[PDB]
Design a protein around this ligand. Structure first.
Ligand SMILES: Nc1ncnc2c1ncn2[C@@H]1O[C@H](COP(=O)(O)[C@H](F)P(=O)(O)OP(=O)(O)O)[C@@H](O)[C@H]1O
Ligand SMILES: [Mg+2]
Length: 267
């Protein structure tokens, strides 16, 4: 139904590759430039590879990478919208990361919060919210991507440095655990793509997170923004803010929260 013929595609350029299979740029019906999330020959079972595409079928928002089409047999493809600027993580680390200041970074955060607020309304969980799974387009447009672990509320593993403790420990994945991940994402944005918890290996991470350790306010980051991070990192998942709140907060940030912001050397 979302199905198309392999005829219609043509995989041109190989952009990355991620161990569950491959990702190419390409065209579709000749007319349209697309991205094609493929699979090298039988990696992970074809139908658990199917269900990222079904998650993407039910979801549609301007701040989510739009599904275009699917090819449900072999070799499988997942045809999606193409984002010219690649992953947010590489963008922050790369050449353009120098020039990004807090107003640009907060606006990127606002967009991501907007996309997740939609996920919130639709009663889904992403379970893998991080800068590496955000895609940038033209005009600094940011969209949430990679719904391989996304599921309706009622495989592989999970990066502990981005995962809420209750989810990493007891498998309790909610929209509130995604809120935790968003808070971690905010540190990625404000540190130009640096790995969270510097010098801390994976379960030094959780054991400290369980003693109540939280990442400190990044250099040149306003404390009001670090306060927002800390709210996203509250031990009780239910004390955590909504993405609806986060979106409005970030959209209005430089008028309501930091009206006297002045540019620094990095932020
Ligand atoms: N819609 C799009 N427009 C433009 N570029 C896109 C794009 N989608 C992906 N890329 C690009 O494909 C690369 C390799 O896949 P990745 O490193 O992302 C990982 F594998 P991915 O998480 O996709 O694989 P998997 O974990 O198996 O789902 C990434 O660097 C990403 O920028
Ligand atoms: Mg990815």
């Amino acid at each position: 139904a979302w199905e198309i013929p392999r005829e219609s595609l043509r995989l041109e350029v190989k952009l990355g590759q991620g161990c569950f299979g491959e990702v190419w740029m390409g065209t579709w019906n000749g007319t349209t430039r697309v991205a094609i999330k493929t699979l090298k020959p039988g990696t992970m079972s074809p139908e658990a590879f199917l269900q990222e595409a079904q998650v993407m079928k039910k979801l549609r928002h301007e701040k989510l990478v739009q599904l275009y089409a699917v090819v449900s047999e072999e070799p499988i493809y997942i045809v999606t919208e193409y984002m010219s600027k690649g992953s947010l993580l590489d963008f922050l680390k790369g050449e353009m990361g120098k020039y990004l200041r807090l107003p640009q970074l907060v606006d990127m955060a606002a967009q991501i919060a907007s996309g997740m607020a939609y996920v919130e309304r639709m009663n889904y969980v992403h379970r893998d919210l991080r800068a590496a799974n955000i895609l940038v387009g033209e005009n600094l447009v940011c969209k949430v991507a990679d719904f391989g672990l996304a599921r309706l509320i009622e495989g592989a593993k999970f990066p502990i440095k981005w995962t809420a403790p209750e989810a990493a420990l007891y498998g309790r994945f909610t929209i509130k655990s995604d809120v935790w991940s968003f808070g971690i994402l905010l540190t990625e944005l404000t540190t130009k793509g640096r790995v969270p918890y510097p010098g801390m290996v994976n379960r030094e991470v959780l054991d400290q997170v369980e003693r109540g350790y939280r990442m400190p306010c990044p250099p040149e980051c306003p404390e009001s923004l670090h306060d927002l991070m800390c709210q996203c990192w509250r031990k009780d998942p239910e004390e955590r803010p909504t993405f609806e709140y986060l979106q409005a907060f970030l959209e209005d940030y430089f008028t309501s929260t930091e009206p006297q912001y002045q540019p620094g050397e990095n932020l």
